Structures are given as C-alpha cells and as structure tokens.
C-alpha cells in the first residue's frame, strides 16, 4: 500500500528526469538543479494500488548537510548514476553507499543507471574517448552493484523510453513490499 523512495546520486546524473517521467510522463525541457522535492500520490502497479512517496535530492555536496534529512523512513533508496560518465559511478562506491550505509542502515538499495541512451550518442562518445574513457559497460554497472551490496542492478533511459522507467520503479515497489 504504501512506500517512501528516495533517490540519491551525483548532480546532473538523472533523478529528476527519472521521477519526473514516472510520475508524470514529462521529461523535464530545462534542467534546474535539485534541492527536494517530494510526490505524494496513489499508482496504479500492474494492478494493486500503491501509495508512492517519492523523493527528490541534491547530488551537490554543498546540500550534503540537509540531504539526511529525507531519509528516515524509507522503504527503497535508488543510488543513481550517470552511464555517460563513470566518475559518478565511483562516487557510488566511495559516496553514496556510505552515505545511505550509515543513515539508512536497513534499507534496500537499488543501483540505478540512468541515461542508458548516450552509449550510441557519438558526442557522448568522442569526448569520453578524448579522455580515455567510455560509458560506463553493463557488466561495470552490474559488478558495482555487487560490491556496494544493492539488492539489484537496473538501466534506464528517461529520455528515450518511458518503459524502462516505469520498471526501474515497479522494481524498487518489489524491493519495498519484499522487505
Ligand atoms: N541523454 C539523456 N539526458 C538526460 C537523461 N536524463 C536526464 N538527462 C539530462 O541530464 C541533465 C540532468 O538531468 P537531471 O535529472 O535534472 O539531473 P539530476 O540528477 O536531477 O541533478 P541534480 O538535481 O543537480 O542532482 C539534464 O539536462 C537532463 O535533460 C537521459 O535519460 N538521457
Ligand atoms: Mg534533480
């Protein structure tokens, strides 16, 4: 019936376009940096009613001092990051997990890899080539969900597909009701 999600990842790495098309199917036009933001309302879940309290976040450190505060409660924690940029992945590992780890000790946690999309962008690809990077690879995203122990590894493209964002959260209800 009901479950409070937060979600939580370095800035620019797609929370906000992910909740927002799941939960109004509109992908933000313009980017405007996070402080909270919280979406209170009933889904439709296959079938059964859910009662979502989805949360919003800061992935600056600047908000690192008020970001806890959202955590009490919460049945799922989605730590995101950014596929086109494999510097927010390690910040899952040497970050997030520790953050969520220590104010949310007995929560799930979800890996989420978000902007799944730009592993075809060419432009994508010629400036992480230009430093010798590429996106973060499937596998890279699966074993960092291993070593930070989240209950599961998922990806999804807000931009490009609707679907894949509904089962990022049709997962993270499962992971909630499982408990
Ligand atoms: N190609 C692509 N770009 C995306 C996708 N999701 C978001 N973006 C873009 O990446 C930028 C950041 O997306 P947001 O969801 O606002 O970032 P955030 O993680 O909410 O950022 P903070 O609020 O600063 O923590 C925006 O310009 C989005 O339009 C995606 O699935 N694909
Ligand atoms: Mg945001």
């Given at each position: 019936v009901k479950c409070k999600i937060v979600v939580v990842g370095d800035?620019?790495?797609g929370k906000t376009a992910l909740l927002h098309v799941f939960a109004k199917d509109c992908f933000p036009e313009n980017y405007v940096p996070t402080v909270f933001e919280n979406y209170t309302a009933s889904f439709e879940i296959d079938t059964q009613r859910i009662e979502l309290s989805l949360w919003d976040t800061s992935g600056?450190?600047?908000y690192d001092n008020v970001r806890?505060?959202?955590?009490?409660?919460?049945?799922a924690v989605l730590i995101c990051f950014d596929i086109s940029r494999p510097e927010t992945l390690d910040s899952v590992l040497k970050k997030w997990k520790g953050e969520i780890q220590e104010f949310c000790p007995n929560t799930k946690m979800l890996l989420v890899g978000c902007?799944?999309?730009?592993?075809?962008?060419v432009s994508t690809l010629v400036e992480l080539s230009n430093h010798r990077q590429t996106p973060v690879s499937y596998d890279q995203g699966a074993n960092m969900a291993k070593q930070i122990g989240a209950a599961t590894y998922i990806e999804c493209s807000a931009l490009q597909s609707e679907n894949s964002v509904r089962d990022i959260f049709h997962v993270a209800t499962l992971a909630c009701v499982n408990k």
């Open positions: 800035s620019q790495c600056s450190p600047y806890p505060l959202s955590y009490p409660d919460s049945d902007k799944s999309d730009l592993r075809t962008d």
